[PDB]
């Protein structure tokens, strides 16, 4: 699993066209104020262990930034060892559940399987942009 | 070299704190309307050949999107095989020059070696977000 942590002043997205034959989540849109936006690429061989490590780290980074909202944003573009869409969806669902066991704030999992438009204002501080990998 | 192509409706950035002891470019800020924003991570072993392949591809993708502005945005976070900062800066300078030989529109190389704040509104169409790697 490959992740990009973006500490945002604000974030919003809207699904547009389906990116998969049949997206496993319904379409939608949401917007937020200050949040950690976690661009999440599920990789082949990610399993429950991988999810749990990632959940703990997101939690720990969120605490360090004093943020109370995390967006789990499915992203197909952070690596060249993608898991297939069904495995990917499953792991993102597990990640959402796992994060709630480690982090007390708002967790928003954005829909999987769509192209999206988005807008973000990413903060300038030294820890506002970082990437992290997890495996098992 | 690892790149992320974001077709934006608008883009802006501002350097904040120096991210390197002595950043090789001066601080600054710019904003744009419709542009291809190329988050660019220089990797160990990128050379002139790598640059030229990347320049041709950016050019060809820009043409396909009918965009006339490309932002070359130094980004340290797209892979785990980073070139050292001096090699990285050099390659980004080469990339800027190479792109101008292949693409007729506005090429803006954003400064290297700073933390930055940025804001982007990324389009929803199917080719609005893609990643590409180049090597030699
Ligand atoms: N291995 C993987 N990890 C994370 N997400 C993955 C995935 N495989 C498929 N997806 C999802 O399906 C959409 C099309 O690839 C993806 N959509 C996106 O990447 C949009 N942000 C592009 O606008 C994503 O929702
Ligand atoms: N291998 C590499 N490829 C591309 N850029 C690289 C690099 N090594 C260092 N940099 C630059 O130095 C800043 C701190 O890493 C980097 N700054 C950034 O990545 C900001 N957008 C974070 O806010 C970047 O300008």
Residue numbers in the entry:
A (entry chain A), B (entry chain A): 1 to 136
Any passages from the paper?
We have been interested in a D-aminoacyl-tRNA deacylase (DTD) fold that is present across the domains of life in two different functional contexts: as an N-terminal editing domain (NTD) of archaeal ThrRS, which specifically removes non-cognate L-serine mischarged on tRNAThr, and as a freestanding ‘chiral proofreading' enzyme, which removes D-amino acids from tRNAs in bacteria and eukaryotes. Both share a striking structural and mechanistic similarity highlighting a common ancestry. While demonstrating that the tRNA provides the catalytic group, we show that the side chains within the recognition site are dispensable for the proofreading function, suggesting a primordial mode of protein- or peptide scaffold-based enzymatic activity evolved alongside that of RNA.
To understand this intriguing mechanism of cognate substrate rejection in NTD, we have solved high-resolution crystal structures of ApNTD, as well as NTD from Methanococcus jannaschii (MjNTD) in complex with non-cognate and cognate substrate analogues L-seryl-3′-aminoadenosine (L-Ser3AA) and L-threonyl-3′-aminoadenosine (L-Thr3AA), respectively. The co-crystal structures of ApNTD were solved in P41212 space group with only one monomer in the asymmetric unit, as the biological dimer axis coincided with the crystallographic twofold axis. The carbonyl oxygen of the substrate has a water-mediated interaction with His83 in PabNTD, while the same atom interacts directly with the corresponding His77 in ApNTD and His84 in MjNTD.
